[PDB]
């Protein structure tokens, strides 16, 4: 128990949970100071690619 | 993977997350770093230097 437990803990260890839903959310961020025109255009650009 | 490789534009750094999990992360007022420092003052000019 002691022998197997010791090298079996030193293995991977990553952040806690993740819940995957059916549909997914896409957040892409850019620099601040963008116009409601370009930012809207930007939104359409990506959506057509998606 | 295909989406992150297809949908992408200059300056626009892409990111993908779950809807519900995101919404939680959103309205979440707080700090992500395990250690944070709040330098408060009277005039922004001074604290920003701190």
């Amino acid at each position: 128990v002691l022998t197997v437990l010791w090298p079996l803990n030193k293995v991977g260890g990553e952040f806690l949970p993740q819940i995957n839903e059916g549909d997914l959310l896409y957040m892409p961020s850019t620099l601040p100071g963008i116009s409601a025109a370009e930012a809207a255009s930007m939104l359409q650009k990506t959506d057509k690619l998606i | 993977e295909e989406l992150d490789n297809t949908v992408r534009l200059p300056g626009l750094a892409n990111l993908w997350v779950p809807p519900i999990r995101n919404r939680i992360d959103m309205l979440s007022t707080g700090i992500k770093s395990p250690i944070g420092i709040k330098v408060s003052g009277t005039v922004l000019a001074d604290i920003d230097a701190m």
Binding site: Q44, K48 | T6
Partner: peptide, 26 residues
Amino acid sequence: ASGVRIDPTQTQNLGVKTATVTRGPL
């Protein structure tokens, strides 16, 4: 590595009211 092509121009097929040019008096 996606050479996926896309139309840059603005696009609208979900709500655009159109009218026809006419000849008549004011």
